[PDB]
Design a protein around this ligand. Structure first.
Ligand SMILES: [Cl-]
Ligand SMILES: [Cl-]
Length: 162
């Protein structure tokens, strides 16, 4: 299992614009297009992302390609963030993937906001962190996924995704 697979499981794959769980326009593999209510705006950002007139629909290859950039961007965002970097550096390979997932779903900023959990992860207090991470809107709104990510930090294994 790896980061790609993991996220592919949490996000799914859709080749037509759709609304995510927060109601925002997305496409592909969790690729957010815009927070705006406007479908045109969405279609517009999509074309600009893809580099052609898509009329709201893309191919598998195109999705995958965006997915790859988005993963890369997430890592890169982590490495550039003063609060994240150190946590990430302290972690083993599996758990890193867990931090990437959260950043891909919520943004670097959102994540950097879980101060207390981060500290805990840095200290390798698995159970404690898992409990703190659950007291969050994130967990309340997308509980199944949050559960998968949290178990992963808790156990250091891929069991939640097997
Ligand atoms: Cl883009
Ligand atoms: Cl969920």
């Amino acid at each position: 299992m790896n980061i790609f697979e993991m996220l592919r499981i949490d996000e799914g794959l859709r080749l037509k614009i759709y609304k995510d769980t927060e109601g925002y326009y997305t496409i592909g593999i969790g690729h957010l297009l815009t927070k705006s209510p406007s479908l045109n705006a969405a279609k517009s950002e999509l074309d600009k992302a893809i580099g052609r007139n898509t009329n709201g629909v893309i191919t598998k290859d195109e999705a995958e390609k965006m997915f790859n950039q988005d993963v890369d961007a997430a890592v890169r965002g982590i490495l550039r963030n003063a609060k994240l970097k150190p946590v990430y550096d302290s972690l083993d390979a599996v758990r890193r993937a867990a931090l990437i997932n959260m950043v891909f779903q919520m943004g670097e900023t959102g994540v950097a906001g879980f101060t207390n959990s981060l500290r805990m992860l840095q200290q390798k207090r698995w159970d404690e962190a898992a409990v703190n991470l659950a007291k969050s809107r994130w967990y309340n709104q997308t509980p199944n996924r949050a559960k998968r990510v949290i178990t992963t930090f808790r156990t250091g294994t891929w069991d939640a995704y097997k």
